[PDB]
Design a protein around this ligand. Structure first.
Ligand SMILES: Oc1ccc(I)cc1
Ligand SMILES: Oc1ccc(I)cc1
Ligand SMILES: Oc1ccc(I)cc1
Ligand SMILES: Oc1ccc(I)cc1
Ligand SMILES: Oc1ccc(I)cc1
Ligand SMILES: Oc1ccc(I)cc1
Ligand SMILES: Oc1ccc(I)cc1
Ligand code: SF4
Ligand code: SF4
Ligand code: SF4
Ligand code: SF4
Lengths: 419, 445
């Protein structure tokens, strides 16, 4: 805790920008953009990239493999890794929960079963009893830890990182047609009392002053098997942890008398929010590197008008370390990560130009996922900041939610470190 | 020098030979779930603080509202201010986000689906076929290791396996008709028989919930609550650690059922439904039954929630454990003396139920659970005083004498600070989290 104190910077977003920067349309990510969406499977059939990746998972199971060229102990072990991966995603919609105000990501609590059951108490209808940002910051961070965050930070909302247009589906489209009917929808800020969705726009109130960012730690032993199946499993379980975090915390904020917008992988760019909220620093590979977990940590965030004290950004030397390290760039199976210096100009449509960062080719990264049948993660696994076969993982150390008691003390929290 | 705590060594020392530890006689019958104090008509209605008779949880709601308005965190317990009182109830209410009508008891509804076929996750993964491909592993030894590893990923702090004893499965469940939307669920609850038949998969008809005769095993999970929050019982922060753990139970069930299905087997979730969690936990070796009626575990005492999953997956049953709880409960009686409703007996165990809420025919301490429930509207919470005062809930019970582990007999002789004090992820305590580390050796023998 006093380590993190040592590295607090003075207030101010540390992301350097120029006058070319514009908000970024979510459809441009490699996951969704038409130029990157379709990729061949191992048979040469072109399909949506995740369906070709499915074909590789099936082929690996039948051939008793945990990953590309990686023989499992037997077919049973191969099957178990994919079963664990698939199960981890149970509380996540279509890989990331990105559709705003759909399924688990509702922008109002009013229709949720938990809100209905609690309606006679009227917590969501009662004006706030606490408006002091200091007390609120302590309450909401305590709640965040109950809700499964291993790290939590607060920043003013920088609209530069909010997607200009979200990827979503029409509100009456049933789940079974969702993947075939994704659309783009603008996210705008207006003078309205509550977050609201019209036919035309997702409307965030101008009072939405703050963003709360959570880090959800992944399991080191499993991530070290990247690009094989157990790295996929710790990824997947943490997405469901993100979803529960967003819902738990939004409900807490609503029952305190404020509004709250969940996001998971939607709404805006998590790495930028996490850096501004002080969880860590941007890195060569492009992830937020944290002191506690390096880049081996997932991110989610919640937007709110609840008064809060912003945390300070931290500087523990990541930028200078990544300058000379280049280990992620040398081991990346697709050569997606640059060995060059940071610029303001993106490599392709998948990058947001106008901000100083290491510019990576994220279509090359995604191209390796159908090939390998997984979500790679080699850059995370080799990064020195992540530090301190698959049969040995299944036979080896585990604990609740994949957390490690050898390090869990480092995320203990008292009021002194919350506000 | 002090020997470092070894939770695995403790469980090995107190393991007992195979066999259900629960002593029963011939008057034992399966228990209709409607008989619980939460649901039965004799106990369901309680007065609020104005003397109005209402469903008990609605009278409890009225008391929460009154406490917030009066700046209290519990009965005659002043909060630091109204904002603190409000914060405690907001945290409690939020905790329940992934739980239907206080316990997820309706089988094969909402989160508790008996088949994965309609779930969004199953649909998304359908092209891989994991739920339709026959199992690639049938060896119960490897399956036990796989499923326990998955259980820990899924949020279990403790996990154990038992053969399914049908004595503890409810004869009839409380549920709602399949065509009833959530908004009307509380007004449309019904009973439905739980039966065992020669069918390939768990199935529900208009008249019965059908568990297959092949459903051999039950997997029991312990979900640890937070010590500092539970010690505020009967006040609001004990309600909050209870509530959050119910949503953790729900996630566990769904995660684990999907893993089992994707391994080629079927899985039935339950949370507080389907059967009696304390008996399953005892038979799976998580702990022992206690005077208060809860399962007491070596790691957490009774300050741990339970859920369970039923499956045909071949597994190795765990051994029951006997670390002397019965003998300590015979002479302790702290929970009985501190219980604000006098619900817990100070007398001997018997086979005769105290009232309709107890299942007769099994040797246990017989408590009056209508008296317990009656205190919840009075206090505006879920009490928990018995859990809070139990010496096993405290985290330093265990000492090593140079030869073996033993219980320290010396143990049996506010809310602002909680909000301002120690916390960690999911409320777990890093000073004890090493106790639940797991390697293959302690997952399967
Ligand atoms: O972050 C992500 C998103 C989609 C998938 I498929 C895997 C990892
Ligand atoms: O053209 C296509 C085909 C499948 C999908 I899913 C989306 C677009
Ligand atoms: O061509 C396309 C496909 C998906 C989306 I969202 C937008 C345009
Ligand atoms: O265990 C339980 C069940 C219902 C309620 I309301 C509180 C605690
Ligand atoms: O066209 C398809 C088929 C399967 C899935 I999963 C999504 C889109
Ligand atoms: O609001 C209400 C009223 C009766 C019942 I039964 C449940 C909820
Ligand atoms: O009369 C009753 C009472 C409880 C239930 I569940 C159904 C019918
Ligand atoms: S591997 Fe090295 S260069 Fe890449 S993100 Fe990690 S520290 Fe930076
Ligand atoms: S996930 Fe793999 S392919 Fe993608 S950038 Fe990292 S190392 Fe390269
Ligand atoms: S308080 Fe004492 S008698 Fe009651 S359950 Fe705990 S050990 Fe047993
Ligand atoms: S929860 Fe409270 S009222 Fe109920 S048995 Fe325990 S101490 Fe008594």
């Amino acid at each position: 805790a006093e380590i993190r104190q040592q590295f607090a910077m003075t207030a101010g977003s540390p992301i350097i920008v120029n006058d070319k920067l514009e908000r970024y349309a979510e459809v441009r990510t490699a996951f969704t953009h038409p130029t990157s969406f379709f990729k061949p499977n191992y048979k040469g059939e072109v399909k949506p990239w995740f369906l070709s990746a499915y074909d590789e998972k099936v082929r690996q199971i039948e051939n008793g493999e945990n990953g590309p060229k990686m023989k499992a102990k037997n077919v049973g072990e191969a099957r178990a890794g994919r079963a664990l991966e698939a199960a981890g995603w149970t509380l996540d919609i279509n890989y990331g929960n990105i559709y705003p105000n759909r399924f688990f990501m509702l922008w109002s609590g009013e229709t949720m079963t938990n809100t209905q059951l609690w309606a006679p108490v009227g917590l969501d209808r009662r004006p706030p009893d606490t408006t002091d940002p200091v007390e609120l910051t302590n309450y909401v961070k305590f709640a965040a830890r109950m809700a499964g965050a291993d790290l939590v930070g607060v920043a003013r909302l920088n609209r530069n990182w909010v997607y200009s247009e979200a990827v979503t589906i029409p509100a009456d489209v049933p789940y079974e047609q969702s993947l075939h009917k994704e659309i783009e929808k603008p996210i705008v800020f207006k003078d309205v009392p509550l977050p609201i969705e019209t036919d035309d726009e997702l409307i965030i109130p101008n009072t939405c002053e703050n963003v709360i960012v959570a880090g959800i730690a992944m399991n080191r032993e499993m991530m070290q098997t990247a690009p094989n199946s157990m790295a996929c499993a710790t990824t997947a379980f943490c997405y469901s942890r993100m979803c529960m975090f967003d819902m738990w915390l939004c409900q807490f904020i609503r029952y305190m008398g404020y509004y709250a917008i969940p996001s998971c992988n939607g709404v805006g760019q998590s790495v930028a929010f996490a850096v501004e909220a002080g969880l860590g620093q941007a890195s060569r590979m492009g992830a937020c590197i944290t002191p506690e977990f390096g880049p081996n940590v997932r991110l989610t965030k919640v937007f709110t008008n609840m008064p809060l004290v912003p945390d300070k950004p931290i500087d523990f030397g990541v930028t200078e370390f990544c300058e000379t390290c280049k280990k992620c760039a040398r081991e990346c199976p697709s050569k997606a990560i640059t060995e060059g210096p940071r610029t303001f100009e993106g490599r392709s449509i998948h990058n947001q130009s106008g901000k100083l960062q290491w510019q990576n080719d994220y279509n090359k990264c995604l191209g390796y996922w159908p090939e390998s049948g997984g979500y790679c993660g080699v850059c995370v696994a080799v990064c020195p900041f992540t530090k301190g076969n698959i049969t040995e993982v299944w036979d080896g150390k585990i604990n609740t939610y994949g957390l490690d008691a050898d390090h869990f003390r480092d995320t203990v929290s008292f009021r002194k470190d919350r506000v």
